[model samples]
Target: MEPAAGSSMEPSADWLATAAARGRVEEVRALLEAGALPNAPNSYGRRPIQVMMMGSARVAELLLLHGAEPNCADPATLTRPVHDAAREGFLDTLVVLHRAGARLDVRDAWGRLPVDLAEELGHRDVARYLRAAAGGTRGSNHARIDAAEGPSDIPD
Candidate 1:
């Protein structure tokens, strides 16, 4: 979809979202420059940053710099950007999201944190990092993943 034709004035929010999802940096940059909101949700309530390209840290950086919320989630799943980065096993993007202030404690519809998603997808690196990040988040009361909770990862 050569958005070139429709991008003359202001492209649709969905257009901005799709470009961000595809990791088209130029299009995203142009759209953002054209005043497309970094946090604007598409017709389905999916924001540009929430469905960003998983493997592209640059896209994440650009979006965050442009005011995209670090933890904006989709209405259908409440799946945040960090969750997608973890599920897709993109540690760079995950790190970018985290550095942009994405919280590790937030849970999705199924009560799965980004760490749980990483574990489910076998992204050990991502899971491990998230576990570490989730630790000491103010030192109130945090449960260590290894906290002798008996065997069985428990399909909870």
Candidate 2:
């Protein structure tokens, strides 16, 4: 369906997905209001949130606010949106997913975590951030345990 002309609701998963893939927040918002499930997977086994991460931070944020699952995985690939963001080097999208509760340790069908994918893609910066986000040490040179585990107000 096209954008609402005189009605309150909005069509085309093809159109919707395409709009979302392109980061068309206006169309995406309308589509969602028009009864489109934010978690609906397209032919690619990708939810709007997943595809949105490829382009639109705005659309991604909208989806998350509407309850899109950051943990949604492609059926065949078993890779979540977080994995896609990392592999694609979309650091902003990755941060959005993380803040939206996407886990860093989630593995794909081949048992590859997001950090592993980032490393393979030579996205060292993303990999390092993903590692630390997963609560691992920041780098080889940095060796510090969880300070939260220590004391509430003590100096080490």
Candidate 3:
């Protein structure tokens, strides 16, 4: 796998987090490309994606494509990216997180759902979309497990 890529001016200890939090797609991309852990916690014990900018969907996309955990909740807050995106007015970012399979119903440390933030923030469109997603089938945790009668069709 010697494709030949040079290394220079390498990122510091926390650039991954800075680029992600500030929504620098170019920097984030190249940094991750040049060898870095997507899920590594920063100095503050927060992963890059955990502090991503809610204003930039492109950054979210890059983080997600690089294998960041879109569906995972932040440790201290128990909040997912969707919670932050919806709390503000970043429907674009919210949409990106949504399609990446983020859980819309995930609550924060305060037990408020993403939709709760959407509603409180007066982002009607965001609230509407979040409500729809909440009612969607993807979040179905399986109402019941099937028990086969005998594991053979018609007991044949």
C-alpha RMSD of each candidate structure in angstroms: 8.4, 11.1, 10.3
Q: After superposition, how far is residue 114 of candidate 3 from its true place, in Å?
A: 0.9
Write the residue-wise lDDT of candidate 3 on 107-128 in tens digits: 7778567777788877777878
Which should have the higher lDDT, number 2 or number 3? Answer: 2
Q: Scored by Cα lDDT, where does model 3 land? A: 0.69
Clashing pairs counted in every model: 0, 2, 0
Per-model TM-score versus the true fold:
0.72, 0.67, 0.68
The lDDT leader among the candidates is: 1
For model 2, the superposed segments whose C-alpha errors exceed 4 Å read: 1-16, 33-35, 136-156
Q: After superposition, how far is residue 151 of candidate 3 from its true place, in Å?
A: 40
Choose the strongest candidate by TM-score.
Answer: 1
Q: 14-60, model 2: which lDDT tens digit per residue?
A: 44566777768898788767766766666656766677746567776
Runs in model 3 deviating more than 4 A are 1-13, 43-46, 136-156
Candidate 3 residue 67 C-alpha distance from true site, Å: 1.0
lDDT of 1 by residue, 34-129 (tens): 887777766545557667767676777777777776776766677777677778788887777777777667777884678888888878899889
lDDT of each: 0.72, 0.70, 0.69
